[PDB]
Motif scaffolding. Structure first.
Motif, mmCIF file in Angstrom:
data_model
loop_
_atom_site.group_PDB
_atom_site.id
_atom_site.type_symbol
_atom_site.label_atom_id
_atom_site.label_comp_id
_atom_site.label_asym_id
_atom_site.label_seq_id
_atom_site.Cartn_x
_atom_site.Cartn_y
_atom_site.Cartn_z
ATOM 1 N N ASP A 48 0.827 -1.209 0.000
ATOM 2 C CA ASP A 48 0.000 0.000 0.000
ATOM 3 C C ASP A 48 0.859 1.257 0.000
ATOM 4 O O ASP A 48 0.640 2.173 -0.798
ATOM 5 C CB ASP A 48 -0.934 0.009 1.210
ATOM 6 C CG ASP A 48 -2.020 -1.038 1.116
ATOM 7 O OD1 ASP A 48 -2.296 -1.508 -0.006
ATOM 8 O OD2 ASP A 48 -2.599 -1.386 2.167
ATOM 9 N N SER A 51 2.778 1.505 -3.351
ATOM 10 C CA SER A 51 1.900 1.868 -4.456
ATOM 11 C C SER A 51 1.577 3.353 -4.444
ATOM 12 O O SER A 51 1.329 3.941 -5.502
ATOM 13 C CB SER A 51 0.608 1.051 -4.392
ATOM 14 O OG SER A 51 0.856 -0.334 -4.523
ATOM 15 N N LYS A 52 1.564 3.977 -3.262
ATOM 16 C CA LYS A 52 1.289 5.407 -3.195
ATOM 17 C C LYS A 52 2.503 6.238 -3.562
ATOM 18 O O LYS A 52 2.355 7.348 -4.076
ATOM 19 C CB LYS A 52 0.806 5.795 -1.798
ATOM 20 C CG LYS A 52 -0.703 5.894 -1.680
ATOM 21 C CD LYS A 52 -1.392 4.638 -2.217
ATOM 22 C CE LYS A 52 -2.904 4.772 -2.136
ATOM 23 N NZ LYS A 52 -3.289 5.502 -0.894
ATOM 24 N N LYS A 101 -5.368 -5.036 -5.201
ATOM 25 C CA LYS A 101 -6.133 -4.003 -4.511
ATOM 26 C C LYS A 101 -5.723 -2.603 -4.952
ATOM 27 O O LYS A 101 -6.566 -1.702 -5.046
ATOM 28 C CB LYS A 101 -5.956 -4.165 -3.000
ATOM 29 C CG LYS A 101 -6.705 -3.155 -2.153
ATOM 30 C CD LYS A 101 -6.429 -3.391 -0.673
ATOM 31 C CE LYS A 101 -5.040 -2.903 -0.282
ATOM 32 N NZ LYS A 101 -4.686 -3.257 1.129
ATOM 33 N N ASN A 102 -4.436 -2.398 -5.233
ATOM 34 C CA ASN A 102 -3.927 -1.097 -5.643
ATOM 35 C C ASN A 102 -3.945 -0.889 -7.149
ATOM 36 O O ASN A 102 -3.381 0.101 -7.625
ATOM 37 C CB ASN A 102 -2.492 -0.910 -5.137
ATOM 38 C CG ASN A 102 -2.431 -0.621 -3.660
ATOM 39 O OD1 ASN A 102 -2.468 0.538 -3.255
ATOM 40 N ND2 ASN A 102 -2.301 -1.668 -2.845
ATOM 41 N N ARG A 104 -2.282 -2.564 -9.363
ATOM 42 C CA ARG A 104 -0.898 -2.712 -9.793
ATOM 43 C C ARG A 104 -0.680 -4.041 -10.503
ATOM 44 O O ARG A 104 -1.329 -5.045 -10.192
ATOM 45 C CB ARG A 104 0.046 -2.641 -8.587
ATOM 46 C CG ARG A 104 0.129 -1.282 -7.920
ATOM 47 C CD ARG A 104 1.139 -0.431 -8.631
ATOM 48 N NE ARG A 104 1.252 0.903 -8.054
ATOM 49 C CZ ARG A 104 2.182 1.778 -8.412
ATOM 50 N NH1 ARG A 104 3.058 1.451 -9.350
ATOM 51 N NH2 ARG A 104 2.224 2.978 -7.856
#
Ligand SMILES: CCCC[C@H](O)CO
Length: 230
Positions: A48, A51-52, A101-102, A104
């Motif tokens: 998470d 990914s940000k 979820k991201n 990616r």
């Protein structure tokens, strides 16, 4: 959510690693086998946050030599190979979840997935050459081996075991196989630059950055420590 953005505080190995980190081009997340730190929740936190922050995210899992870590702590090859397959599948599942979820790409490899990659093989050959020929480098690699065995002797609840040389030399095959990604992960994978990210300092990396060996990190390769703070 910006608790995600700040999930980790970053400590670079060198000022060059800091520059590469600030470029945010690529992060390689090292997931250590048989290490209780890498729960489902923590793997999600790593991905998470990554990914940000980063343009590109890759997850590195342990390859075949992960069995050596168990074989050195008294595990017959049959049971060791089973435990590895199960551990790697767990890491892949949780990593795939969080990447998906991201939004990616599912960019997950083991360090055994590059036997046909010229960069991996040539760096690996360099690592093995200096392990044989430079006693100082050999000593540092064996210390990484000792670290790997000592932490899993505690983890697997075997703290009573003497760590012998034969144990160290068996488990150092793991160290030597993973090291090309510490030294040249960006170039192996094909990114302009990259940081390998982990939650503990890399002592041999400090010596490499102090110009103590003919082994060098690639100019486009960095290492960062991920800390969590309140
Ligand atoms: C997949 C090997 C794990 C790499 C991490 O940086 C810890 O060695």
């Amino acid at each position: 959510q910006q608790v995600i953005k700040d999930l980790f505080y970053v400590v670079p190995l060198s000022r060059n690693c800091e520059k590469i980190y600030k470029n945010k081009t690529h992060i390689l997340l090292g997931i250590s086998p048989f290490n209780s730190k890498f729960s489902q929740n923590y793997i999600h936190q790593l991905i998470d946050w990554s990914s940000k922050n980063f343009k590109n995210v890759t997850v590195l899992l342990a390859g075949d030599e992960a069995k050596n870590l168990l074989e050195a702590l008294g595990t017959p090859t049959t049971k060791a190979e089973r435990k590895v397959r199960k551990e790697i599948r767990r890491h892949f599942r949780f990593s795939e979840e969080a990447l998906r979820k991201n939004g990616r790409e599912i960019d997950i490899y083991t360090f055994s997935d590059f036997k046909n990659n010229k960069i991996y093989n040539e760096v690996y050959q360099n690592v093995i050459y200096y392990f044989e020929k430079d006693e100082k480098f050999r000593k540092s690699c064996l210390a990484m081996s000792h670290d790997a065995l000592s932490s899993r002797a505690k983890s697997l609840n075997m703290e009573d075991i003497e760590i012998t040389d034969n144990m160290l030399f068996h488990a150092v095959k793991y160290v030597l196989a993973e090291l090309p990604f510490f030294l040249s992960g960006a170039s192996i994978l094909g990114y302009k630059e990259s940081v390998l990210a982990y939650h503990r300092p890399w002592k041999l990396g400090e010596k490499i950055k102090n110009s103590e060996f003919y082994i060098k990190m690639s100019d486009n390769q960095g290492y960062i420590i991920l800390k969590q703070i309140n």
